Design a protein around this ligand. Structure first.
Ligand SMILES: [Cu+2]
Length: 304
């Protein structure tokens, strides 16, 4: 359980990093705790594997981000305060009773160097815990496999977030549409995660190419928000449009909710050939709203 060393070298090029809560005593149900772990190398390195070290009963949710400024410098903190004060580049999400996302063979996230993130920030959410267990420190976390051997495919995140959108009170279905033109080298989408708050019914993401929608994925965002795998990975390519839709319900809500708060985020996890690769992309617009008249019917079907 509690108390390998922080850094464990493996061959010339490889090392393991144990990212572990420093003996925390979670009081209270659904409390999100955070710790940072600086990268031991200044040079470019590649995260090529992950291994959860989650306590069985206590832990329901773990996230790992890549970023440059962690919100606290303390040995741990509460992620209510924040994760990183800058852009938090998400790398790994784990839920209990969830298919954990596993990097395809030659894929790694690019960290360190001038570009890449310097810190990992770990986020561990605990269940109901409860009972008469205050005499218990927890060291939950995850081990990361890093190497300085350059990888031929580089993983990254395409984040789609809604910003315009107002949820009127009482309307049973409200749609939040997001769309950008893709204008880079090809990316290959292998997983997705969806974030909303209370009112999300379902989030869906698509590549649209010559007016044909291909599914990237869809999920009820009230399920655990891990990275779900893509059945067959989707190449997204120059002149494709990425388009997302969230269905909210303002049933019972007392007044207008904006995006008292709500979010629609789609995390699209991809790989790109190392030379043309980018670690991060974003859409926060709906350039092609007219298009959504076309959207497959399956995108408005609830996932209860
Ligand atoms: Cu949120």
């Amino acid at each position: 359980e509690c108390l390998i060393g922080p850094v464990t070298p493996l061959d010339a090029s490889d090392f393991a990093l144990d990212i572990r809560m420093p003996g925390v005593t979670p009081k209270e149900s659904d409390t999100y705790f955070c710790m940072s772990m600086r990268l031991p190398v200044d040079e470019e390195a590649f995260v090529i594997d992950f291994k959860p070290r989650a306590s069985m009963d206590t832990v329901h949710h773990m996230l790992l981000f890549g970023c440059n400024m962690p919100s606290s410098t303390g040995s741990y903190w509460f992620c209510d305060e924040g994760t990183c004060t800058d852009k938090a580049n998400i790398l790994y999400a784990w839920a209990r009773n969830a298919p954990p996302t596993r990097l395809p063979k030659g894929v790694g996230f690019r960290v360190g160097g001038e570009t890449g993130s310097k810190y990992f920030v770990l986020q561990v959410a605990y269940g109901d815990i409860s009972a008469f267990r205050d005499n218990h420190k927890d060291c939950s976390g995850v081990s990361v496999h890093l190497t300085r051997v350059p990888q031929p495919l580089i993983a990254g995140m395409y984040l789609m977030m809604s910003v315009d959108t107002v949820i009127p009170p009482g309307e049973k279905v409200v749609n939040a549409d997001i769309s950008c033109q893709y204008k880079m080298y090809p990316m290959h989408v292998f997983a997705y995660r969806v974030h909303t708050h209370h009112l999300g019914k379902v989030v869906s993401g698509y590549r649209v190419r010559n007016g044909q929608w291909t599914l990237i994925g869809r999920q009820n965002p009230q399920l655990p928000q891990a990275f779900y795998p893509v059945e067959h990975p989707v190449d997204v390519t120059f002149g494709d449009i990425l388009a997302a839709r969230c269905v909210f319900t303002g049933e019972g809500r007392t007044e207008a909710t904006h995006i008292s708060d709500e979010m629609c985020n789609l995390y699209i996890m991809y790989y790109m050939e190392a030379k043309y690769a980018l670690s991060f992309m974003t859409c926060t617009k709906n350039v092609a709203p007219d298009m959504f008249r076309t959207i497959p019917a399956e995108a408005n079907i609830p996932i209860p």
